[PDB]
């Protein structure tokens, strides 16, 4: 009984415009990692 | 024969001990190079 399946939610944004410090690269996609 | 205790620093390196000592004091009293 002490092997409970912990389940919670991850979240991540794709394609955000970073505002300028006063930006020619624009993200179309975002990368993540597997469990492998 | 009776066994006398002689002085030696004994470190235990794993399963068998060894008796580390130095004779630099024996060579310095006679002013001899070690």
């Amino acid at each position: 009984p002490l092997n409970r399946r912990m389940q919670y939610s991850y979240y991540f944004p794709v394609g955000l415009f970073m505002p300028n410090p006063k930006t020619q690269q624009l993200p179309v996609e975002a990368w993540i990692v597997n469990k492998n | 024969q009776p066994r006398v205790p002689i002085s030696a620093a004994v470190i235990k390196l794993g399963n068998h001990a060894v008796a580390v000592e130095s004779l630099q004091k024996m060579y310095n009293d006679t002013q001899s190079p070690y």
């Binding site: - | 390196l13 068998h16 001990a17 008796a19 580390v20 000592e21 130095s22 630099q24 004091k25």
Partner: protein, 91 residues
Amino acid sequence: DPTFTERGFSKTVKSDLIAMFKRHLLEHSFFLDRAENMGSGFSQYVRSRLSEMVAAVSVSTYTTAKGGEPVGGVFIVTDNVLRQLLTFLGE
């Protein structure tokens, strides 16, 4: 080392031994100044080099006093190396 003796001796293993001479010369030599040079783990480092130095040459007539352990060898150091061994090997 038994690992390079148990294969007998070939002409291929001789190059491994001549390279292992240099690899043991550059790293393990002057081990006490390296143990003062490095960070933590100096006690295991000094105890490791001394234990390999015992294992290189591998009733009892010379026992310890408060036990019965045969004393199985003797290190002969200088007076400057004796205390730097006795501090890294505290007990």
